[PDB]
Amino acid sequence: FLRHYTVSDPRTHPKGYTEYKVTAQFISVKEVVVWKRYSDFRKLHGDLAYTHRNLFRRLEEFASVIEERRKGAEDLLRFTVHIPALNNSPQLKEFFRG
Amino acid sequence: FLRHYTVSDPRTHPKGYTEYKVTAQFISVKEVVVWKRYSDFRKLHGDLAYTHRNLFRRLEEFASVIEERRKGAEDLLRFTVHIPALNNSPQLKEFFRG
């Protein structure tokens, strides 16, 4: 009961792409870990933006660049913690497979 | 744990405006009742629409007409029940004063 995210420990995969460790922690510690490539965060972001765009349009009807990537993903994730519209998002909850 | 809204029993106020009974029920019954004029629902609606418009624009940065009114308010309220982005809304929770 108090969410905290980190994105860390990038690691190359045998298939070539870099993978990140996404850590979700809950403290009054329960932690959930998944591995994600930057393209996953891109899809997530896109799904959030389109979900809220359409919510809106429905209401109104009636090579250290990967550090930049790691930080971007992490920031984006942190952004949702204290916005219940984003925090409670289904897309967010599916994002954590394992 | 299973939300249900109704808007009902319109009643004129000594000051002239019509007032509605908003009933929020929770069943596995816990019910919360508030009284609201149609202008309140208008403000609510406007706040939801603007909250999600700006969420979007932030993500992408990096005299039976009163029956029509009653129904409109009720429909609008029901709309949020199974959208966690709307259901968990702070504006929604403030809406229930008493």
Side-chain angles (χ1 to χ4, degrees), chain A residues 1-61 63-98, chain B residues 1-61 63-98:
Chain A
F1 175 61
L2 268 164
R3 306 176 183 247
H4 186 43
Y5 299 113
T6 65
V7 174
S8 67
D9 306 282
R11 294 275 320 114
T12 327
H13 186 264
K15 284 193 189 183
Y17 55 76
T18 12
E19 273 177 309
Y20 304 95
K21 179 179 181 175
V22 181
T23 309
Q25 307 171 336
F26 312 95
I27 328 171
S28 84
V29 188
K30 292 182 128 71
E31 75 173 10
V32 164
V33 169
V34 286
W35 289 81
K36 293 271 145 32
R37 30 188 289 205
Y38 185 75
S39 150
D40 295 295
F41 280 98
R42 175 175 287 99
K43 180 177 190 291
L44 174 63
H45 168 280
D47 294 344
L48 297 172
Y50 258 58
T51 303
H52 289 267
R53 205 258 271 114
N54 268 67
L55 234 59
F56 161 75
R57 294 225 319 184
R58 277 256 295 284
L59 293 173
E60 296 201 350
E61 83 180 320
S64 277
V65 309
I66 72 189
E67 161 62 18
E68 303 279 18
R69 287 184 158 200
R70 190 213 52 89
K71 183 187 180 48
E74 186 175 70
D75 286 332
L76 184 84
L77 271 192
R78 273 157 178 194
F79 188 68
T80 72
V81 177
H82 283 82
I83 307 182
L86 292 174
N87 191 17
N88 293 280
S89 176
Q91 290 81 8
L92 200 56
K93 296 175 182 182
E94 259 286 303
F95 192 80
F96 295 83
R97 331 170 171 264
Chain B
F1 175 61
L2 268 164
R3 306 176 183 247
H4 186 43
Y5 299 113
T6 65
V7 174
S8 67
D9 306 282
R11 294 275 320 114
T12 327
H13 186 264
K15 284 193 189 183
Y17 55 76
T18 12
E19 273 177 309
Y20 304 95
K21 179 179 181 175
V22 181
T23 309
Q25 307 171 336
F26 312 95
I27 328 171
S28 84
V29 188
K30 292 182 128 71
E31 75 173 10
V32 164
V33 169
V34 286
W35 289 81
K36 293 271 145 32
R37 30 188 289 205
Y38 185 75
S39 150
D40 295 295
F41 280 98
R42 175 175 287 99
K43 180 177 190 291
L44 174 63
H45 168 280
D47 294 344
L48 297 172
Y50 258 58
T51 303
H52 289 267
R53 205 258 271 114
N54 268 67
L55 234 59
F56 161 75
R57 294 225 319 184
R58 277 256 295 284
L59 293 173
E60 296 201 350
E61 83 180 320
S64 277
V65 309
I66 72 189
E67 161 62 18
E68 303 279 18
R69 287 184 158 200
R70 190 213 52 89
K71 183 187 180 48
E74 186 175 70
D75 286 332
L76 184 84
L77 271 192
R78 273 157 178 194
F79 188 68
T80 72
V81 177
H82 283 82
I83 307 182
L86 292 174
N87 191 17
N88 293 280
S89 176
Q91 290 81 8
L92 200 56
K93 296 175 182 182
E94 259 286 303
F95 192 80
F96 295 83
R97 331 170 171 264

